[PDB]
Write a protein that binds this ligand. Structure first.
Ligand SMILES: COc1ccc(NC(C)=O)cc1Cl
Ligand SMILES: COc1ccc(NC(C)=O)cc1Cl
Lengths: 195, 195
């Protein structure tokens, strides 16, 4: 709420970092390397962002990313399609979302209906090379399915602020070259903290 | 031109990385650490961004960062205040800009008049803790001055896509904990490349 904009801003940051591989490029530089061809990027303008959860944080993510020329589509079981239209998000059924997205970001609570929302089945419905963000709750994205998608190239990269266990005991995801991550920094701004 | 958006998008990524230290957090995580207090961030909303150079790239930066609630001010000796007003940037004299800015980004050519535009003299006029981006041309920001400002804390962080020498022979800046960097990735998208 107070921290809605902090979360939204981190999520936008992560989307940009996935598009241009800034964290990996920084590490490359700090290891004394100059690897231009290796970190060839993607432009956000004209790409489709899928937003799962169209509450406050999801809406703020949407309007920011609209300024980059992203097409914003999304899903929410409560919010009406005419309401979401009013902040620029085209609502569709979940099955329609997967195959259109170049980027997917999650903004839901952790519920039975949202645990493993992204899983082996839904990654198989995505465009090859999809990039995924989770700055919401650990477990919305099934961690084993994500790892398998990254290993096959079905998923070209992921950004994670949250994990099923924190700090994460399993290291496979964190350690993957196409994964960027933070130690649950979503609310961690001076402004969010000091009301 | 074709690559204007690619550059503007990298710039905005770098601003978000400075605000939340995403590259440093990723490196922390990959080294098996979980360092939440270390990577306490700043919210962009309400902060002032100074844009030096209000051509196509600077303007695209401005409208993206306006969506985050940044106040956008800037300087350009050639663009008229009425043109810049049309994309939401308050033009001011250079001497007025420095003290106001939480973030400064440069979007000029490399000319005698822009070489060391940010130097010991102009860092001294900045707000303590200013964060600086250069995704334009190596040398606009004086590299020794930038290093001195980082070491004193006058500058809280810097994002560099470009360097006076490429790759940079001097390593002090790259190696600093508060410097994020890329090997000149501004135009390196599939879209900029493949017209
Ligand atoms: C299955 O997807 C969902 C389930 C629940 C919510 N939101 C709340 C507050 O319950 C959002 C989504 Cl997208
Ligand atoms: C004194 O600073 C400048 C000098 C020149 C330019 N731009 C061009 C196109 O010449 C911009 C600045 Cl900010």
């Amino acid at each position: 709420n107070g921290n809605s904009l902090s979360a939204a801003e981190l999520t936008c940051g992560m989307i940009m970092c996935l598009a241009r591989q800034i964290p990996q490029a920084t590490a490359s530089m700090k290891d004394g390397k100059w690897e231009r061809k290796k970190f060839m990027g993607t432009e956000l303008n004209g790409k489709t962002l899928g937003i799962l959860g169209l509450g406050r944080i999801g809406r703020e993510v949407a309007t920011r990313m609209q300024s980059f020329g992203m097409k914003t589509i999304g899903y929410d079981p409560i919010i009406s399609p005419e309401v979401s239209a009013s902040f620029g998000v085209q609502q569709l059924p979940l099955e329609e979302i997967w195959p259109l997205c170049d980027f997917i970001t999650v903004h839901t609570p952790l519920l039975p209906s949202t645990t493993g929302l992204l899983n082996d089945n839904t990654f198989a419905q995505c465009k090859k090379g999809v990039r995924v963000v989770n700055c919401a709750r650990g477990g919305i994205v099934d961690e084993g399915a994500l790892l398998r998608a990254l290993q096959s190239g079905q998923c070209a990269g992921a950004a994670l602020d949250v994990f099923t266990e924190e700090p994460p005991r399993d290291r496979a995801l964190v350690d993957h070259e196409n994964v960027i991550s933070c130690p649950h920094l979503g609310a961690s701004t001076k402004e969010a903290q000091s009301r």
